[PDB]
CSV table of C-alpha atoms in Angstrom, one decimal:
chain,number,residue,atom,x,y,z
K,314,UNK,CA,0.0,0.0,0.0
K,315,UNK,CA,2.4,3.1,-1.5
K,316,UNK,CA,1.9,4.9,-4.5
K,317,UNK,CA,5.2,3.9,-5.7
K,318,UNK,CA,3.2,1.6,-8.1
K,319,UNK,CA,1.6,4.8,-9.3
K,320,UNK,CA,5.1,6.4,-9.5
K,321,UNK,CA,6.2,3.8,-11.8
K,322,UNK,CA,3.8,3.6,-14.2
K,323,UNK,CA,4.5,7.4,-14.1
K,324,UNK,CA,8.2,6.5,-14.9
């Protein structure tokens, strides 16, 4: 539960 998933996909 992080938004680093979100960051990622961002990436």
């Amino acid at each position: 539960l992080k938004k680093l998933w979100r960051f990622l996909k961002k990436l």
